[PDB]
């Protein structure tokens, strides 16, 4: 049982860390697309110019 | 309209008790506005003078 | 001590709009007992002018004049007579001293300087200081005003005495940095004590009066007319008959029933009886009684009790709703299947007063509590001792029973269980008259008892004098 | 008619799904190694993990553009109701009591009852005065103004 | 200090009772003693509840008592932890009220709430586990206000004059949610704490100057307003140049009136033992600093 | 009463996992019998008894 | 006992049953007839 | 978002009320094995349930 | 315990240079957060031209208190104290602190050197004062909006310019005036007709209170009471209510003071046992 109960935390940590991990890749991916939108005028704008 | 008199003459329409009873049984309203709705006297006296 | 300086204040910084004069007293084993000292929840006073009219009532005369109704359904005027009484009686501020003093040693021991013209010692195993006001209507006071103190207890009994303004004040009338109220009160002290009786002459209290009070400076007038205190003597005389007249009213209704009837008495109550007795030894056994009821008849008769719950202000709102509960049209079949269930009537055992009567040692028992139900073979009454078991005194050929029921039919019962029956009138009393006379005190909350109404309250109040006091 | 006339101007909210377009490194990324620090308790520990991201625009000139390709629908109910300015004003009466009572009883517009603490914050800093409606069919209140 | 404190149970839990006591780790649990080992009788408020009498004593009891959290039981061993000041710690709200970001939070008695199940926990033989409510201060003096005005206003009055009134005052809505306060007598600590109410405001009443006394008769010439309008109206069915400007007078009698104020104030005022920054977004638990 | 936290101990079958509306969605509009919902991490799993 | 008894069966079938039962003039034997004790029980809103 | 359209019906023990909703037609004698068009629209309890 | 803060602004060596003079001065911010934006950094957030000083006290009271300990680049470190335990803070209000003082926090009232300003913001940092330097700005500022209605009198605008100034241990300043424009800000305002409020509701409660409590127990305390308060009308003397309507005086004589408590209480946040030389900091016991 405390053989189980250890291997219970190391994979609630390993848990930890992927969904922590994962995430990070998705702030990433939804910085980057917040950073574009601040950047990217409509059509009507860019067509007229 | 004629055809709707099996509807129209039966006596549960010209019957006001139960609309009476559960006009009584909410009370009168408690809102200010509708207060001014409540204040009304009625009072019969005698017709000789 | 204190709540007679506190209360002097407190009349002074009152007396513009009320125009009452503070009246210190104190009371002792010669009025309350050491149990009633010890649990007494108010003191309740009234003032009633030489004319006999209270002055918590319109000044010229009330609706409440009028006589009583002999209806459940009005029950002598409902709410509105039980709050303009309920309005007549002012609630006074009162301490208890618990344990066995005298008098002018514990006013020395306080603050107080007393001066008295004879330095005569009086002894008290308890002690209750409080103060009530007279009403000087103007700057002028009669002898004729009586004043009504009040004692009550914490399950709602009351004690009534009355005095009248005469007798506290053939004495006191016919001769007539910065200072804090407080000090001078206490330097300037005492320097009167007097015994003052009652009207009736049953209880003695003594009347306490300082130098420094406010009623020293107003300088009014006081006057005590012959035909004024004639009047007064005249509305007390009415007060106290209100009981004897009710009995009297009985009396005349059993002897008028007793008339009419021609002396047939059906039977109303349970009781076998044999035809092989002499029934005369037993009408003449009902002579003695009924005259001996006359003889021993008191306030606590069974019909002062049976009008008493009718006074609350309860009464009439529930007599009207039994009265809509037995005359409500019967259940039609879908009120039956698919509405409420209908209300329980009444129960089949009710609660009665009776007054007992035994010839053979003359006794007379008055405020008797009996449970009286129809038996199903037979409509009778069986009247039962309130733990449940059968009264015997139907089977006693020496006493005869007056019951008087909730909703005031009188039945008077002869051994073997044949009885007169009718009803108590009560016309010849002024509403105001038995109202004031019999209503039950409710009580206003104090320490110790729950906001909600109907709860369980806790240990009750009490003083004690045989334990050292909890603070 | 009153004598004159109303321009009422409504603000309606729709749902929109937006189009992006940007070119090939339009944009240079620099981002750290991640940094984490700890933060304890008695039963449990929190863990803050934080990366820095800081972003150049590499384009002269505009480098992407968004369309509003798709709306799928209005949030608001596109109604005919005015904007209560006794709720956008809560302190202003009228000078004589009189005349408030009943201007207010015939606009029908609810004087607060009692001076709680919330009428007080109400009155003096603002609040959510306006309650939420029992049922709501058409989805959000547009409310109309008047000029 | 004793830091952890043994709660020994007599009776023998059953499964459902280790499993019911687990899911409550982390709940504030009160000790009357402050002890380093304690029998389960002493747990929770269940030693102290009486309803004859009034909720004012069970509230004077509680306040006097010792906070714990509760952490891991084992067999018939409960082990009950002590916060310390300042220090940060998960707590558990099986109260019904809601906590928002940076509440305050006070111990009271629990009310009566609705559905009146009420969730009984650990009934063992008679015993059972009574938690009080952690209660946000705004919720918490509002019941003593309203408590502290039943006592002040039933005095002397009937219970005919009295039960529609106290019926409104028993009732506090607090975020959407109705509570009503048990049982609300009066008690030999209430008319203390009237008795305290009577001269604070006596000295209130004494000891304000002309300028404290007369501003809103001023504002009520100059300003109109809601605000104003209800100010007035409380005044209502009882309803110039200064003679004295002294800035010494006006500091020496505001020094006291906001003496004579906090001493009116603590009637309602309640010892604050946490502050929430963090909120579960179920509302079941909090992070909360520990105060006292 | 469900024993969730032998869910948690016992060993599982992963799965694509396949909800019309979001996860949070129909769990808090009453898709599901039984729920258990905990935010954090729960060590009601480790005290096996 | 009566109290509860009637706070359990409050729908139209019961609440007829017992004015069926009170309706008529004959007494309650020539009125009831006994079937068997009861074991088995399929639960619907015509139940067997 | 107005109070009713038809004050007659829409109300609590109007005539429409008292007559199609259920809990009103028991009261009065209905007989129950007539279906009734109205009864969804002013059975108000099964609207609340 | 360190909590990031982050500038979304351009900084410059000037503004770094500014910020690293206040490496241990005490920085409010709105709730705990691990990564904050300097918008929410320091009292500026909270500044309008309506509400003024009572607002910002009430909004100053529940607030995180927060040391700052570094600015590694972009980014500024703040450092949350635990009670009990002993920390550097730097003092920038306007008086000096000596050993054992009681410090309070107030919100600014002087504003050069210290002011960072960058995008119409700029960090304004609540003033660190000893206890009694507290209390009495506090009772000046109120009183200052008590004379509020009569500033039409020679002697009041004198009296106003007294209560302007007050000196404290080798320091001497002028309060602002709340009156500006003629006119009393809402938040000061309301504030005055609580404490005016509270004062007449207690002054026509009061008689009948004591009336009532004397009636259980006539203790020594309500005679004295009561004679306080027939001593008041006989002053006042120079020149029935309903249930519902009682309830409603006591309701609002309680809900008008609790209006008052954040002005009547004062919470010390640190106690100062050592000082530098130079009055520029000293070393605290964190209160919280």
């Given at each position: 049982l405390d053989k189980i109960l250890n291997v219970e935390a190391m994979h609630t940590v390993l848990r930890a860390l992927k969904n922590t991990a994962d995430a990070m890749e998705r702030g990433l991916i939804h910085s980057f697309l917040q950073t574009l939108l601040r950047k990217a005028p409509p059509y009507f704008v860019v067509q007229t110019l | 309209f004629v055809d709707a008199l099996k509807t129209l003459c039966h006596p549960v329409l010209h019957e006001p008790a139960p609309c009476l009873q559960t006009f009584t049984e909410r009370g009168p309203p408690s809102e200010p506005a509708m207060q001014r709705l409540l204040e009304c006297r009625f009072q019969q006296e005698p017709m000789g003078g | 001590m204190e709540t007679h300086l506190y209360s002097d204040l407190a009349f002074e910084a009152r007396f513009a709009d009320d125009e009452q004069l503070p009246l210190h007293l104190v009371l002792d084993q010669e009025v309350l007992s050491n149990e009633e000292a010890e649990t007494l929840r108010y003191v309740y006073y009234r003032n009633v002018d030489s004319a006999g009219r209270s002055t918590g009532r319109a000044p010229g005369g009330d609706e409440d004049d009028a006589?009583?109704?002999?209806?459940?359904?009005?029950?002598?005027?409902?709410?509105?007579?039980?709050?303009?009484?309920?309005?007549?009686?002012?609630?006074?501020?009162?301490?208890?001293?618990?344990?066995?003093?005298?008098?002018?040693?514990?006013?020395?021991?306080?603050?107080?300087?007393?001066?008295?013209?004879?330095?005569?010692?009086?002894?008290?195993?308890?002690?209750?200081?409080?103060?009530?006001?007279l009403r000087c209507p103007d700057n002028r006071l009669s002898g004729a005003q009586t004043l009504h103190l009040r004692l009550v207890w914490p399950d709602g009994s009351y004690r009534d005495w009355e005095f009248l303004a005469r007798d506290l004040l053939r004495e006191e009338m016919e001769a007539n940095d910065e200072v804090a109220r407080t000090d001078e009160w206490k330097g300037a002290g005492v320097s009167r004590l007097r015994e003052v009786w009652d009207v009736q002459h049953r209880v003695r209290l003594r009347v306490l009066w300082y130098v420094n009070s406010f009623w020293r400076s107003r300088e009014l007038s006081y006057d005590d007319h012959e035909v004024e205190l004639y009047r007064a003597l005249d509305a007390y005389r009415?007060?106290?008959?209100?009981?004897?007249?009710?009995?009297?009213?009985?009396?005349?209704?059993?002897?008028?029933?007793?008339?009419?009837?021609?002396?047939?008495?059906?039977?109303?109550?349970?009781?076998?009886?044999?035809?092989?007795?002499?029934?005369?030894?037993?009408?003449?056994?009902?002579?003695?009684?009924?005259?001996?009821?006359?003889?021993?008849?008191?306030?606590?008769?069974?019909?002062?009790k049976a009008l008493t719950p009718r006074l609350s202000r309860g009464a009439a709102a529930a007599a009207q709703r039994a009265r809509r509960q037995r005359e409500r049209s019967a259940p039609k079949p879908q009120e039956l299947l698919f509405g409420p269930r209908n209300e329980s009537g009444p129960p089949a055992e009710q609660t009665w007063y009776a007054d007992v009567v035994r010839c053979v040692r003359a006794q007379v028992d008055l405020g008797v509590e009996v449970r009286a139900a129809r038996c199903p073979r037979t409509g009778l009454w069986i009247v039962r001792d309130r733990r449940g078991r059968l009264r015997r005194w139907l089977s006693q050929p020496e006493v005869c029973v007056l019951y008087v029921t909730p909703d005031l039919d009188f039945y008077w019962v002869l051994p073997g269980g044949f009885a007169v029956s009718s009803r108590?009138?009560?016309?010849?009393?002024?509403?105001?008259?038995?109202?004031?006379?019999?209503?039950?005190?409710?009580?206003?909350?104090?320490?110790?008892m729950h906001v909600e109404a109907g709860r369980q309250e806790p240990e009750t109040p009490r003083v004690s004098g045989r334990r050292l006091p909890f603070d | 008619h009153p004598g004159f006339a109303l321009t009422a101007v409504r603000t309606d909210t729709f749902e929109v799904d937006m189009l992006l377009y940007?070119?090939?490194?339009?944009?240079?990324?620099?981002?750290?190694?991640?940094?984490?620090?700890?933060?304890?308790?008695?039963?449990?520990?929190?863990?803050?993990?934080?990366?820095?991201?800081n972003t150049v625009d590499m384009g002269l000139g505009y480098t992407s553009n968004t369309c509003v390709a798709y709306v799928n629908r209005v949030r608001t109910d596109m109604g005919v109701r005015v904007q209560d300015l006794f709720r956008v004003f809560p302190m202003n009466v009228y000078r004589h009591d009189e005349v408030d009572r009943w201007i207010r009883h015939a606009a029908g517009v609810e004087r607060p009852q009692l001076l709680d603490t919330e009428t007080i914050s109400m009155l003096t800093f603002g609040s959510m005065s306006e309650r939420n409606a029992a049922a709501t069919v058409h989805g959000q209140k547009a409310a109309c103004e008047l000029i | 200090m004793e830091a952890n404190i043994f709660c020994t149970f007599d009776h023998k839990l059953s499964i459902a009772d280790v499993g019911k006591l687990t899911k409550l780790v982390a709940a504030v649990v009160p000790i009357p003693q402050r002890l380093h080992l304690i029998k389960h009788y002493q747990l929770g408020l269940?030693?102290?509840?009486?309803?004859?009498?009034?909720?004012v004593r069970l509230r004077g009891l509680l306040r006097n008592m010792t906070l714990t959290l509760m952490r891991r039981v084992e067999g018939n061993q409960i082990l009950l932890h002590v916060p310390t000041h300042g220090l940060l710690y998960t707590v558990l709200n099986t109260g019904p009220v809601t906590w928002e970001k940076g509440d305050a939070l006070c111990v009271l008695p629990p009310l009566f709430h609705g559905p009146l199940a009420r969730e009984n926990l650990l009934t063992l033989g008679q015993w059972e586990l009574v938690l009080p409510w952690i209660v946000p201060m705004?919720?918490?003096?509002?019941?003593?206000?309203?408590?502290?005005?039943?006592?002040?206003?039933?005095?002397?009055?009937?219970?005919?004059?009295?039960?529609?009134?106290?019926?409104?005052?028993?009732?506090?809505?607090?975020?959407?949610?109705?509570?009503?306060?048990?049982?609300?007598?009066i008690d030999?600590?209430?008319?203390?704490?009237?008795?305290?109410?009577?001269?604070?405001?006596?000295?209130?009443?004494?000891?304000?100057?002309?300028?404290?006394?007369?501003?809103?008769?001023?504002?009520?010439?100059?300003?109109?307003?809601?605000?104003?309008?209800?100010?007035?109206?409380?005044?209502?069915?009882?309803?110039?140049?200064?003679?004295?400007?002294?800035?010494?007078?006006?500091?020496?009698?505001?020094?006291?009136l906001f003496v004579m104020l906090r001493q009116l104030d603590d009637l309602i005022r309640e010892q604050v033992v946490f502050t929430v920054c963090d909120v579960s977004p179920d509302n079941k638990s909090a992070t909360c600093i520990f105060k006292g | 009463m469900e024993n969730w936290s032998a869910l948690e101990l016992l060993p599982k079958v992963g799965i694509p996992t396949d909800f019309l509306t979001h996860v949070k969605t129909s769990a808090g509009e009453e898709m599901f019998e039984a729920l258990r919902i905990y935010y954090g991490d729960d060590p009601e799993r480790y005290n096996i008894h | 006992t009566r109290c509860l008894l009637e706070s359990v069966y409050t729908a139209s079938a019961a609440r007829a049953a017992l004015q069926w039962l009170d309706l008529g003039p004959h007494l309650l034997h020539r009125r009831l007839e006994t079937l068997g004790c009861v074991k088995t029980v399929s639960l619907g809103i015509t139940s067997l | 978002f107005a109070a009713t359209h038809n004050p007659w019906a829409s109300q609590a023990g109007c005539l429409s009320d008292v007559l199609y909703n259920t809990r009103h037609r028991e009261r009065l004698g209905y007989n129950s094995k007539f279906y009734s068009p109205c009864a969804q629209y002013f059975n108000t309890e099964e609207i609340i349930a």
């Amino acid at each position: 049982l405390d053989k189980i109960l250890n291997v219970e935390a190391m994979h609630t940590v390993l848990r930890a860390l992927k969904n922590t991990a994962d995430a990070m890749e998705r702030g990433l991916i939804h910085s980057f697309l917040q950073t574009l939108l601040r950047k990217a005028p409509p059509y009507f704008v860019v067509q007229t110019l | 309209f004629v055809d709707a008199l099996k509807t129209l003459c039966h006596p549960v329409l010209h019957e006001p008790a139960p609309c009476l009873q559960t006009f009584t049984e909410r009370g009168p309203p408690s809102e200010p506005a509708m207060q001014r709705l409540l204040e009304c006297r009625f009072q019969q006296e005698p017709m000789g003078g | 001590m204190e709540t007679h300086l506190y209360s002097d204040l407190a009349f002074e910084a009152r007396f513009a709009d009320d125009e009452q004069l503070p009246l210190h007293l104190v009371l002792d084993q010669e009025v309350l007992s050491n149990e009633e000292a010890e649990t007494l929840r108010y003191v309740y006073y009234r003032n009633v002018d030489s004319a006999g009219r209270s002055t918590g009532r319109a000044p010229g005369g009330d609706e409440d004049d009028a006589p009583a109704s002999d209806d459940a359904e009005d029950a002598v005027g409902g709410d509105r007579a039980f709050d303009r009484e309920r309005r007549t009686w002012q609630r006074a501020c009162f301490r208890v001293l618990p344990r066995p003093l005298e008098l002018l040693d514990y006013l020395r021991q306080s603050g107080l300087t007393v001066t008295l013209e004879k330095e005569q010692r009086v002894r008290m195993f308890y002690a209750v200081f409080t103060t009530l006001g007279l009403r000087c209507p103007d700057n002028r006071l009669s002898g004729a005003q009586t004043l009504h103190l009040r004692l009550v207890w914490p399950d709602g009994s009351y004690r009534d005495w009355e005095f009248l303004a005469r007798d506290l004040l053939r004495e006191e009338m016919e001769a007539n940095d910065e200072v804090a109220r407080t000090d001078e009160w206490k330097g300037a002290g005492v320097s009167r004590l007097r015994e003052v009786w009652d009207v009736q002459h049953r209880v003695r209290l003594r009347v306490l009066w300082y130098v420094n009070s406010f009623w020293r400076s107003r300088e009014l007038s006081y006057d005590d007319h012959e035909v004024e205190l004639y009047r007064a003597l005249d509305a007390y005389r009415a007060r106290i008959a209100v009981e004897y007249v009710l009995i009297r009213a009985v009396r005349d209704e059993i002897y008028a029933v007793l008339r009419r009837d021609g002396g047939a008495l059906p039977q109303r109550f349970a009781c076998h009886v044999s035809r092989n007795m002499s029934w005369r030894v037993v009408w003449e056994l009902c002579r003695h009684a009924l005259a001996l009821w006359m003889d021993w008849a008191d306030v606590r008769s069974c019909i002062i009790k049976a009008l008493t719950p009718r006074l609350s202000r309860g009464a009439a709102a529930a007599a009207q709703r039994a009265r809509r509960q037995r005359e409500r049209s019967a259940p039609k079949p879908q009120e039956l299947l698919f509405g409420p269930r209908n209300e329980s009537g009444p129960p089949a055992e009710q609660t009665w007063y009776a007054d007992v009567v035994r010839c053979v040692r003359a006794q007379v028992d008055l405020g008797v509590e009996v449970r009286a139900a129809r038996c199903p073979r037979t409509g009778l009454w069986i009247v039962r001792d309130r733990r449940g078991r059968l009264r015997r005194w139907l089977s006693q050929p020496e006493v005869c029973v007056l019951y008087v029921t909730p909703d005031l039919d009188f039945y008077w019962v002869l051994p073997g269980g044949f009885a007169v029956s009718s009803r108590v009138t009560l016309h010849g009393l002024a509403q105001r008259a038995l109202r004031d006379r019999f209503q039950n005190f409710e009580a206003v909350l104090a320490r110790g008892m729950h906001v909600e109404a109907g709860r369980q309250e806790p240990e009750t109040p009490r003083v004690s004098g045989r334990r050292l006091p909890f603070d | 008619h009153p004598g004159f006339a109303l321009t009422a101007v409504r603000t309606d909210t729709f749902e929109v799904d937006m189009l992006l377009y940007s070119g090939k490194s339009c944009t240079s990324v620099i981002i750290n190694n991640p940094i984490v620090t700890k933060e304890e308790r008695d039963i449990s520990t929190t863990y803050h993990v934080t990366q820095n991201i800081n972003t150049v625009d590499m384009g002269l000139g505009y480098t992407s553009n968004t369309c509003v390709a798709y709306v799928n629908r209005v949030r608001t109910d596109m109604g005919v109701r005015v904007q209560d300015l006794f709720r956008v004003f809560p302190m202003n009466v009228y000078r004589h009591d009189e005349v408030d009572r009943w201007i207010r009883h015939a606009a029908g517009v609810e004087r607060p009852q009692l001076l709680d603490t919330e009428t007080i914050s109400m009155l003096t800093f603002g609040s959510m005065s306006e309650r939420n409606a029992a049922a709501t069919v058409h989805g959000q209140k547009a409310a109309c103004e008047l000029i | 200090m004793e830091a952890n404190i043994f709660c020994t149970f007599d009776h023998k839990l059953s499964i459902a009772d280790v499993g019911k006591l687990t899911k409550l780790v982390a709940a504030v649990v009160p000790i009357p003693q402050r002890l380093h080992l304690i029998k389960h009788y002493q747990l929770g408020l269940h030693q102290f509840v009486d309803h004859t009498r009034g909720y004012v004593r069970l509230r004077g009891l509680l306040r006097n008592m010792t906070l714990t959290l509760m952490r891991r039981v084992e067999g018939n061993q409960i082990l009950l932890h002590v916060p310390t000041h300042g220090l940060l710690y998960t707590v558990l709200n099986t109260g019904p009220v809601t906590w928002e970001k940076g509440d305050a939070l006070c111990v009271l008695p629990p009310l009566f709430h609705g559905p009146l199940a009420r969730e009984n926990l650990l009934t063992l033989g008679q015993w059972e586990l009574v938690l009080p409510w952690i209660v946000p201060m705004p919720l918490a003096l509002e019941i003593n206000q309203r408590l502290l005005i039943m006592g002040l206003f039933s005095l002397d009055r009937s219970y005919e004059e009295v039960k529609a009134a106290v019926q409104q005052l028993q009732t506090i809505t607090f975020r959407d949610a109705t509570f009503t306060i048990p049982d609300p007598v009066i008690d030999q600590h209430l008319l203390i704490d009237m008795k305290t109410a009577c001269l604070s405001m006596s000295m209130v009443a004494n000891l304000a100057s002309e300028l404290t006394m007369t501003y809103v008769r001023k504002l009520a010439l100059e300003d109109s307003s809601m605000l104003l309008v209800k100010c007035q109206e409380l005044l209502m069915r009882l309803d110039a140049r200064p003679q004295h400007v002294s800035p010494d007078d006006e500091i020496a009698r505001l020094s006291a009136l906001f003496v004579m104020l906090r001493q009116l104030d603590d009637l309602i005022r309640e010892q604050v033992v946490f502050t929430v920054c963090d909120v579960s977004p179920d509302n079941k638990s909090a992070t909360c600093i520990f105060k006292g | 009463m469900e024993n969730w936290s032998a869910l948690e101990l016992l060993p599982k079958v992963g799965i694509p996992t396949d909800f019309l509306t979001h996860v949070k969605t129909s769990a808090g509009e009453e898709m599901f019998e039984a729920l258990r919902i905990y935010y954090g991490d729960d060590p009601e799993r480790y005290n096996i008894h | 006992t009566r109290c509860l008894l009637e706070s359990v069966y409050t729908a139209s079938a019961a609440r007829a049953a017992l004015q069926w039962l009170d309706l008529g003039p004959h007494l309650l034997h020539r009125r009831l007839e006994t079937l068997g004790c009861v074991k088995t029980v399929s639960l619907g809103i015509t139940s067997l | 978002f107005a109070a009713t359209h038809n004050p007659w019906a829409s109300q609590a023990g109007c005539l429409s009320d008292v007559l199609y909703n259920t809990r009103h037609r028991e009261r009065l004698g209905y007989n129950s094995k007539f279906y009734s068009p109205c009864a969804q629209y002013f059975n108000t309890e099964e609207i609340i349930a």
